[PDB]
């Protein structure tokens, strides 16, 4: 689990969105596994605006943060799960690192701020849904 809180927005994995997230929907994209809902409280996270390929992510299944090198956002084939059939997920970045399904939502950060959230994984890889291109999260 995990979310990004910026301004009057809450960014979560679309497959983990709650009833309140859907009742206050701002934007969702199944191909990216992202959903953004509105909040009454003001969020303080900073979103990165950059093309970094190194950062640190939080891994809840180890209670640890790990430093990683990751690929630029791209269209990657993702195996079926209980939430989606096998499909291409867009805006996805991969790294070599540990992840389990419950790790989804953990933040990946660089020196500029929040880069994205854990969304995919398996076989010693971890994939992150990018949020750096969502310029509207700031205004
Ligand atoms: N299509 C998606 O974005 C998600 C939907 C929900 C889901 O359980 N997964 C699989 C998954 C995510 S982290 C991880 C780590 C080790 C094994 C499996 C997984 C994919
Ligand atoms: Zn950066």
Swiss-Prot record:
Annotated residues for binding of Zn(2+) 1: 50, 52, 110, 112
The organism's taxonomic lineage, starting at the top: Viruses, Riboviria, Orthornavirae, Pisuviricota, Pisoniviricetes
Protein name: Protease 2A
Location of the active site: 15, 33, 104
Catalysed reactions, as listed in the record: Selective cleavage of Tyr-|-Gly bond in the picornavirus polyprotein
UniProt subunit comment: Homodimer.
Residues of the full protein shown: 869 to 1007 of 2193
Organism: Coxsackievirus A16 (strain G-10)
Function: Cysteine protease that cleaves viral polyprotein and specific host proteins. It is responsible for the autocatalytic cleavage between the P1 and P2 regions, which is the first cleavage occurring in the polyprotein. Also cleaves the host translation initiation factor EIF4G1, in order to shut down the capped cellular mRNA translation. Inhibits the host nucleus-cytoplasm protein and RNA trafficking by cleaving host members of the nuclear pores. Counteracts stress granule formation probably by antagonizing its assembly or promoting its dissassembly.
